[PDB]
Amino acid sequence: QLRQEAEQLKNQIRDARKACADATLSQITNNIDPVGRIQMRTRRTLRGHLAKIYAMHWGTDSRLLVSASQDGKLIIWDSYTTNKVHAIPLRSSWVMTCAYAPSGNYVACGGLDNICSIYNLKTREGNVRVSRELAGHTGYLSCCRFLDDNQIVTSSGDTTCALWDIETGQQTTTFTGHTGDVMSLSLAPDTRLFVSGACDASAKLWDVREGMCRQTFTGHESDINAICFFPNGNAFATGSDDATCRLFDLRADQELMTYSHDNIICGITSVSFSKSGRLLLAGYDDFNCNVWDALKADRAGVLAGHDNRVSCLGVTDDGMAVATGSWDSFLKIWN
Amino acid sequence: AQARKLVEQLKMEANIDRIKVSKAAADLMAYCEAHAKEDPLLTPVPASENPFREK
Amino acid sequence: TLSAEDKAAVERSKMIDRNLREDGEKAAREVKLLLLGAGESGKSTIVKQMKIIHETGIVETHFTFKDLHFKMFDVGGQRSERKKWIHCFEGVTAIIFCVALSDYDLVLAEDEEMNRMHESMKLFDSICNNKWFTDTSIILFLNKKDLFEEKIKKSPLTICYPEYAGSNTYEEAAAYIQCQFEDLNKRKDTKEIYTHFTCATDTKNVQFVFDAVTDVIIKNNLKDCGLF
Amino acid sequence: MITAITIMALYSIVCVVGLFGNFLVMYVIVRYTKMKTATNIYIFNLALADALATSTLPFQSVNYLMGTWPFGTILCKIVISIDYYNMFTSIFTLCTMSVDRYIAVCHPVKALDFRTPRNAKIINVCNWILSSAIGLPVMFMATTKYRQGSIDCTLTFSHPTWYWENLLKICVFIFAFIMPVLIITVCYGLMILRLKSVRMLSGSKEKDRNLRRITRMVLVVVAVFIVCWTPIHIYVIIKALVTIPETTFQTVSWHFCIALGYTNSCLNPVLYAFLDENFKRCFREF
Ligand SMILES: CC(C)CCC[C@@H](C)[C@H]1CC[C@H]2[C@@H]3CC=C4C[C@@H](O)CC[C@]4(C)[C@H]3CC[C@]12C
Ligand SMILES: CC(C)CCC[C@@H](C)[C@H]1CC[C@H]2[C@@H]3CC=C4C[C@@H](O)CC[C@]4(C)[C@H]3CC[C@]12C
Ligand SMILES: Nc1nc2c(ncn2[C@@H]2O[C@H](COP(=O)(O)OP(O)(O)=S)[C@@H](O)[C@H]2O)c(=O)[nH]1
Ligand SMILES: C=CCN1CC[C@]23c4c5ccc(O)c4O[C@H]2C(=O)CC[C@@]3(O)[C@H]1C5
To answer: Are A217 and A197 in contact, with CB atoms under 8 Å apart?
Structure first.
């Protein structure tokens, strides 16, 4: 019935993208100066996790981050002095995401319990306690990012993202449209769009203002495990299990660059950009992260020293730190 | 029910603007070269102002 | 050279390390168990039988028995892709795999064509022969005793397996189901399926699972001491 | 004649290979693998006792060679004290490693909390303290005496010498030959019976092969312990009981007994660390 016209509309979209694609990224950057041999060493190491760390997030003060692990502990790391600020006992032993507020007043975490827990960090009593229990999904909460101090956008196991009013504890819009289990999302710097990648090998841009999808990028093969916006908000990179990262454009809609090596087969768990955006650090699954030149697709360096799977990655806002979490219970701050 | 929804959603998605990929890639290149002096990991800084002093 | 604020930060981090060490010592003694099976077979019933005698998301149940603290991980509320969250259960002590004996001829609720027992067999295949459960022994609780008795006194078992040659008695049929549900694993030296038929015998269930946990704890201690 | 040269060769080769093996064990237990488990701490302490015991061998070897001790009273005082000290520390670390394995196998629910690196550390602390508590009498009571135009520094005793030397010799014998042997035999026997009866190690050819390997390594450990300790302890007790006439045969018997008692500490790293399965797993990593 309508499947044939849907298929020819697919073909029309691909034909429009082919016609609009006139020169690849690597053709114009053929004369750019490469970053060359890069070398980075472990300035700090945050020891104190006793189980499998799955995700972390930085802070906008570029000093305090938060980490989560299988033990059920939410440890706030002072990356300057390598200290512990808080230890929040999670009610769920299974978490694979956490978020840190730009205001710092709130912290979030979620996992196989399908519920996002919110804890208050600047409570008048001086301790940390639950403030709102954001429930309403039907799948595991695989990513969470604070839109601001009163909103969080979350990607869940029920193939739908959801903006959340943190005060009332209810959603305001639902981002249905994934034919596959969504894992990661990333927020635009202007905080009006967010792109989320799912297991159907497609990342979708969404309008945060009303709750509608704008593009879909189907370059990858297996399933999307990571995603991160560019600092200008007009591009993003996707991590996935097909041993390849991909850079996309929100406007040109094509696939700009591919980040793969024929000598590596394992998947990619986390991606984050630097300030300039020339530096994309993809946490691989060969026990280390990989430094990628985001214009030449050249592996500039390697970030080795992890005893287990690399689970999460994040570059701080002022770009002085590469915080790598891992399954071997050791965070490593790099510079 | 989902088939007509995806058809209408992707018909709405199809009729959007697409700027030339040379222009977008040049804008990405310009953003990268215009912030090269600001990125600490691309251009390393001496340990005087570095907040990560090993001990 | 540390000021008062740095001293307070160091003391707070030390206190957090102390409470964290106590919590890790508490949590390195607990016993972790993981429930699987088909959506109707046996998992909520066995955890309901468990909770009735000692007292969405993951359902948890904690209890004590012979000065050993156990844990229940019922993942029945995870209506999603099993592949992307199965790696979160590496450090579990043992797996309680609940299947149904009387599901060999029952037709699955979707498409009215696929068999329930063969679907449970495929699930057991994917769970036994994945990269995350190799050193973890799988307990198997072949439930639905009386229903299986009645349905094999009424109907032949050859409708499920078109190779059955034994009589329609309970012992030979249950032995056939057990051995065919055992030999499917591709690695028999390390994996040790401790099978136990049950319907409502609460005392035997906890003793059997404690025996299996004690065996895998013995194996872990033998790995720790370097003997094995 | 030439018997002293063969004794010198035996002492030299035992000391050299013991220090060689102990140095390899120290290097591989520090740099390659870590000491975050109870058994790693126990093997490290055993290697410490074995290296410290076998370093005093060339001192006694040149003591026999020159027939005199030109190294002063304080040096052989600390040598005798550290010899008794190292012999008890090696004995007690073997005994406590054995009882740790027995607790691990036969008492697993209790070993969930009784087997921690902190508990291993405090057991080693109590080990070396309880060895010091009996090596302290050997400290001040050892002295250098003069006899027959030669210098030797066997330790003396109090004014009633006979029951003092009898009591010290029988205390050393009963402790370091009834505490180790009986406890290690009963503990490894109970462990190997319960390890025969377990479901993981019965019902297949590979399970029986693992059973055979575990019983074999236990038997080799107890066998080399007995072979290295019995011919010297009873020789000491019969030299204390009756007066053996001075003959080259009894002197080379004494030297062979000392050499075997040090071959014990030579072979404990080989049969405790090189045969350990976790150490072999670390070996195959490179
Ligand atoms: C040298 C002799 C004569 C003096 C007595 C020293 C004693 C108290 C020393 C010597 C060897 C030491 C042990 C050597 C190794 C370790 C492992 C380490 O991770 C924790 C401490 C521990 C367990 C030590 C405890 C204290 C110890 C037993
Ligand atoms: C239990 C097994 C290992 C056998 C142990 C053998 C030991 C105890 C044997 C081997 C050689 C023996 C010595 C050989 C020679 C002599 C000279 C003789 O005029 C008196 C006995 C005496 C001094 C023996 C004492 C006991 C001795 C040291
Ligand atoms: N006669 C008999 N009935 C049994 C037995 N065990 C369980 N049931 C029932 O079979 C239904 C399946 O739903 P069930 O809860 O198992 O689904 P699930 O756990 O996968 S979510 C439950 O209502 C149970 O009362 C048994 O031995 N004998
Ligand atoms: C192989 C060295 C072990 N030694 C410990 C101390 C001593 C010794 C041993 C066995 C039993 C003892 O009572 C005893 O005291 C000592 C003695 O009288 C001479 C022999 C020893 O140097 C030797 C073995």
So the answer is: no
3-state secondary structure chain C: CCCHHHHHHHHHHHHHHHHHHHHHHHHCCCECEEEEECCCCCHHHHHHHHHHHHCCEEEEEEEEECCEEEEEEEEEECCCCHHHHHHHCCCCCEEEEEEEHHHCCCECCCCCCCEHHHHHHHHHHHHHCCCCCCCCCEEEEEECHHHHHHHHHHCCHHHCCCCCCCCCCHHHHHHHHHHHHHCCCCCCCCCCCEECCCCCCHHHHHHHHHHHHHHHHHHHHHHHHCCC
**Ligand 1 centroid from CA D132, angstroms:** 12
A161 forms beta bridges with A155, A175
Considering only CA atoms, which of D64, D62, D28, D63 is closest in space to residue D44?
A: D28
Q: What distance in Å separates the CA atoms of residue D99 and residue D93, rounded to the nearest whole number?
A: 10
Q: Which residues of C touch A158 (CB under 8 A)?
A: 79-80
How far, in Å, CA of D88 to CA of D95, rounded? Answer: 10
> Residue length, chain B?
55
Whether the CB-CB separation of A46 and A83 falls below 8 Å is answered with no
Burial code (b: 16+ CB inside 10 Å, e: under 16) for A81-116 equals ebbbbbbbebebbbbbbbbbbeebebbbbbbbbbbb
Total count of domains within chain D: 1
Question: Which residue in C192, C225, C227 is closest to D200 by CB distance?
Answer: C192
Write down how long chain D is: 286
Q: Mutate which of D181, D229, D243, D250 to test ligand 2's pocket (most atoms within 8 Å of Cβ)?
A: D250
A–C CB contacts, 8 A cutoff, strictly below? 78
Going by C-alpha positions, the residue among D83, D29, D81 that lies closest to residue D52 is: D83
Q: What is the resolution of this structure in A?
A: 3.1
What was the experiment behind these coordinates?
Answer: cryo-EM
Q: State the amino acid at position C120 in one-letter form.
A: S
Range of the domain at B30: 1-52
- CATH fold label, C2-228: Rossmann fold (3.40.50)
Which of D80, D124, D126 for mutating ligand 1's site (highest number of atoms within 8 Å of CB)?
D124
* Residue-range definition of the domain harbouring residue D97: 3-280
Taking only Cα atoms into account, the Rg of chain B, rounded to an integer number of angstroms, comes to 22
What are the residues whose beta carbons fall under 8 Å from the beta carbon of A180, sequence distance 6 or more?
Answer: A159, A198, A199, A200, A201, A202, A223
Ligand nearest to the CA of C96: 3
Return the CATH superfamily for domain A43-334.
YVTN repeat-like/Quinoprotein amine dehydrogenase (2.130.10.10)
Q: What's phi and psi for D204, nearest 5 deg?
A: -155, 165
Q: What is the CATH number of the domain that holds B7?
A: 4.10.260.10
- A114 interaction partners in chain C (CB closer than 8 Å): 56-57, 77
Distance CA D210, CA D225 (A): 23
Distance CA B4, CA B6 (A): 5
With contact defined as beta carbons under 8 Å apart, do A249 and B17 qualify? no
The neighbouring-strand residues paired with A184 are A197
Cα gap A133→A166, rounded to integer Å: 9
Position D13 in a domain: yes
Residue D285 covered by a domain:
no
CA of D236 to the centre of ligand 4 (A): 7
Q: Do chains A and D touch (3 or more CB pairs under 8 A)?
A: no
DSSP symbol at B44: -
Cα R_g (chain A), whole angstroms: 19
| Structure-token match 């009215």, residue found | C112
The first and second tokens of residue D49, run together, are 């006792």
Domain membership flag for residue D92: yes
> What's the CA gap between A318 and B42, in Å, rounded?
12
Q: Do A279 and B14 touch (CB under 8 A)?
A: no
Residue-wise DSSP of A3-68 = HHHHHHHHHHHHHHHHHH--S-HHHHGGGSPP--S----EEEEEE---S-EEEEE--TTSSEEEEE
Is residue C191 marked as binding? no
